[PDB]
From Swiss-Prot:
Family from the record: Belongs to the AAA ATPase family.
Protein name according to UniProt: ATPase family AAA domain-containing protein 2
Inducers of expression: Up-regulated in breast, uterus, colon, ovary, and stomach tumors. Induced in breast cancer cells overexpressing NCOA3 or treated with estrogen. Down-regulated in 5-fluorouracil-resistant derivatives of the colon cancer cell line HCT 116.
Organism lineage: Eukaryota, Metazoa, Chordata, Craniata, Vertebrata
Residue intervals of the Bromo domain: 3-114
Subcellular localization(s) per the UniProt record: Nucleus
Role this protein plays: May be a transcriptional coactivator of the nuclear receptor ESR1 required to induce the expression of a subset of estradiol target genes, such as CCND1, MYC and E2F1. May play a role in the recruitment or occupancy of CREBBP at some ESR1 target gene promoters. May be required for histone hyperacetylation. Involved in the estrogen-induced cell proliferation and cell cycle progression of breast cancer cells.
Protein's organism: Homo sapiens (Human)
């Protein structure tokens, strides 16, 4: 349907705008790019599914998100990976964990404020029809 394609275009516009807000926030700079495997060689041994905001943007543009919940699962993963990899008492680890939690809380708060519930339901019903 043209109506269905329009819906997913509106979704991608919305997700890009949310992700941009997160990516320009100074607190979340550490989450904007993939962890560099030459810099942190053990990261991909600990973290099975890396995720970062540049990868999220690429997924939006490659039509990988058909619902808001699918997007939020990747926000969850950015947060959970950070908590898993940086668990220690050290202030540097505590700072990363605080920022990871703030990233997730901020994303959910933006979506709660701005997402029309019938729009997400429509995205879900289209997704479930294909």
């Amino acid at each position: 349907s043209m109506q269905e394609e329009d819906t997913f275009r509106e979704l991608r516009i919305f997700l890009r705008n949310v992700t941009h807000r997160l990516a320009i926030d100074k607190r979340f700079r550490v989450f904007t790019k993939p962890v560099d495997p030459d810099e942190v060689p053990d990261y991909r041994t600990v973290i099975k599914e890396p995720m970062d905001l540049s990868s999220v943007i690429s997924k939006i543009d490659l039509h990988k998100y058909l619902t808001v919940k699918d997007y939020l699962r990747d926000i969850d993963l950015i947060c959970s990976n950070a908590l898993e990899y940086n668990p220690d008492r050290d202030p540097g680890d505590r700072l990363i964990r605080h920022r990871a939690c703030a990233l997730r809380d901020t994303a959910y708060a933006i979506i709660k404020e701005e997402l029309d519930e019938d729009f997400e339901q429509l995205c879900e019903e289209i997704q479930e029809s294909r």
